[model samples]
Target: EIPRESLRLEVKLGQGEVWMGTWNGTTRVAIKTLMKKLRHEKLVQLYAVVSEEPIYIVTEYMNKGSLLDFLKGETGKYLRLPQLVDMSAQIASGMAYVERMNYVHRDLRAANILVGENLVCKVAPIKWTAPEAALYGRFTIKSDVWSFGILLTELTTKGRVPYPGMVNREVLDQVERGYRMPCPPECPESLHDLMCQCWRKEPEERPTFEYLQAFLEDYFTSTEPQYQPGENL
Candidate 1:
């Protein structure tokens, strides 16, 4: 149990609303309240917890806030194709790490990812969850992969609202009927194909994060007109 006297709230951060606080009023950290304890590097790092009524899970902070907000801002307008690919690679790296840990994120989206220094992406704040998870509370790595596909669309679209004109029921019905969103204008053919792979009707057919990572790296390497840091697309 964390000593309540030692940890004090400083500010709120992230879509999940984790607390940016101080441990002993010096060390900066982020705290997440959850039903159970969870810890991971690419995921949040659980430093401590309290047994008192509401359990608090404390972790590290990502100063840049959500990827969605970052992409929606003026800086996003300057992002070149390579930088966008770099962003995707960062998220894939985190998901790859999560896959190795044998845990399902359940919810994975642009809003759920935290952007750190030099554009590092850390996955957290999940649970628009998976279809199976929503229907039967079932969650798995494959389900997380599905969410990753949605995140790809979010990135390519530069944070445009997903299923904008559709309601929750329409999205559910459309997805159930295998009506996936078409690739955004200017999205690379290969990248769009990878997104399609992740959204395969059968979870087993979805590519693993490992494959996603490697494929993304290969894309980064092969596609060039490479942007120097801060170069616009």
Candidate 2:
């Protein structure tokens, strides 16, 4: 049995539904666990896993919920452009860390990104699976990059579903042909270009998360207000 010191769980649903609970009475927790383990600031950390029976996987609670839902909320349009950039940059930073750890996210869509209070974001993998993972059962950092491109579109469009009219088979066919979504209205051209880069057909041609992090970093820095150096001491 796992230690229950600060553990206080109230399952909102059983196996059929994703369960939500609270640890230490107030700290909310989610229990959909994963096999791969990562310890990073931008990754959701699980305290423990009970492999027996129903199998419990515990993790941090994100108050604002998925990035998609968060963007759809009333606060989304009110955010300054800089705040939007920050959110994207944070995801890139997290992916860079995941790259260093040699773990392929396999699923890196906006729906998997959790937004917390103050817009904090954590990258988590969902069971949605990637193209490579589905067809060849292969996964690599490059696959994650493709998903990142999709996530970018979701971001610019404020959580519009990708390939709205298309079904799964059509999506796979179009993806094989290298079809990408059109740039969202008001999206910065540079950002859209970056998304295209991430969608390169040859996985080797896609930039690494390290490069993604740097690209986003430069974008964020450029968005900051430039001020003349002052003599006020």
Candidate 3:
């Protein structure tokens, strides 16, 4: 538990009046008025909560901001294939933990992910929703899988808006008719194939976060050549 007196609210963010604040007069933290609430390596770290009236939630400050913004910036543009795969794997790792806890992240998208030091990625929060969820309000782990597929495109394309030149209705209609986004130029065939698996018509057909986590991690590790320090010298 954190004392409300200890928090010094600073800048306000666009969402929920989220404030960048100093906790206990020292540590920088993100303070948001709570509606609800995790801990994982790939997940954002929760510091403390002021659980009285108008509850205050404190989480670690992510200096690099959201993944969407990061991708749109110069740093994201220069990312190599391996780095992109690593980011994807990090997200999958976080989501695997979420799935293990039997929770559903209804909103899974690029903007919801936050980047931090050394380009580390963490799942922040969602709009790349699944078709079934959008159509019938049926949110599930599978729906999150669908959203992750959309996020992969975002990462590959350095945060290009999904289904560009089309509105939400058009995108939904196209998806309903089994149309998937074409593989991006920067994306490899194997990764694109994985995205297709995530977008499978049946929720049951979609890969679990555990499976995705393992697949991405393995894909990243296996393809990269082993380091030989003196080879270039």
Candidate 4:
């Protein structure tokens, strides 16, 4: 438990009351309101909870801000394909743990992910809700997979909004008519194929977070240039 007096709130995040604050005088932390609370390397680290009135949740401070903002900013321009894949794999790893816990994110998107030191991506927690959830209030792991596909587009395109040039209503209509966003030029064919699989009309047809984690991890490792001993020496 953390004392309310220990927290010194700084910047406000988005429209939510989330804040950047200094804890115990030196430690930088992100303070949000509430949740079921789970922990993983790729997910933001929840440090302590103030269970009293107003209930502040303290987490590790991500220095680089949201993945969406990072991608849209100047620094994101230099990102290579491998780094993007690395980020995706990290998110998948986090979601895999969430899946194991039988928790549905209900909100998954690039904006919800925070980038930290060494460009590490951690899932923050939602705007890319699934179509089923939007249409009938059905939120599940599969719905998160759908949002994951949208997030991949954002990463590949350096944070372009999904279904660019289309309004929300138009995008929804197109999606209802079986329209999925075309592959971004910067995205590899294999990744686009995985995105297509995630956006399948049937929820059951979408890939599991476990499968996604494995696939992305394997893809990232296998695609790396092989090292030969003493080759550069």
Q: Order of candidates by lDDT, top first?
A: 3, 4, 1, 2
Candidate ranking under TM-score, highest first, comes to 3, 4, 1, 2
Give all candidates' CA lDDT scores.
0.75, 0.73, 0.83, 0.82
Where in model 1 is the C-alpha error above 4 Å?
Answer: 13-17, 33-40, 53-55, 125-138, 223-233
Best by TM-score: 3
Report RMSD for candidate 3: 4.3
- For candidate 1, the TM-score is 0.81
User: 1-233 in candidate 2: lDDT tens per residue?
Assistant: 35545556666543434567776676788766323567788887776666776666777777777898888898776764456667888899899998898878777888789999988988973223346666787789888887888887777767777876887788888777867777766666677888888877777898988888777767745633442222210
Error of 2 at 118 (Å): 1.1
- lDDT of each residue in 1-233, candidate 4, tens digit only: 97789999988875537888899999999888754468788888888898877888898999889998888887887877667778999999899988898998877988789999787999872236577888889999999999998888888887878787887888778788988888787456678999999999899999999998888878755643442223111
Window of ten residues with lowest summed lDDT in model 1: 224-233
Q: Higher lDDT: candidate 2 or 3?
A: 3
Kindly list the per-residue Cα lDDT of model 3 for residues 29-128, writing each as its tens digit: 9888851346788888889887788988899898888899988887875776667778889999999989998999888888889999887999872238
TM per prediction: 0.81, 0.80, 0.88, 0.87
* Candidate 1 local lDDT, 50-83, one digit each (tens): 7785677766777777899989987788766666
Instruction: Point to the candidate with the largest lDDT.
Output: 3
Total backbone collisions for each predicted model: 1, 0, 2, 0
How high is the lDDT of residue 72 in model 3? 86
| Each model's Cα RMSD | 3.8, 6.1, 4.3, 4.8
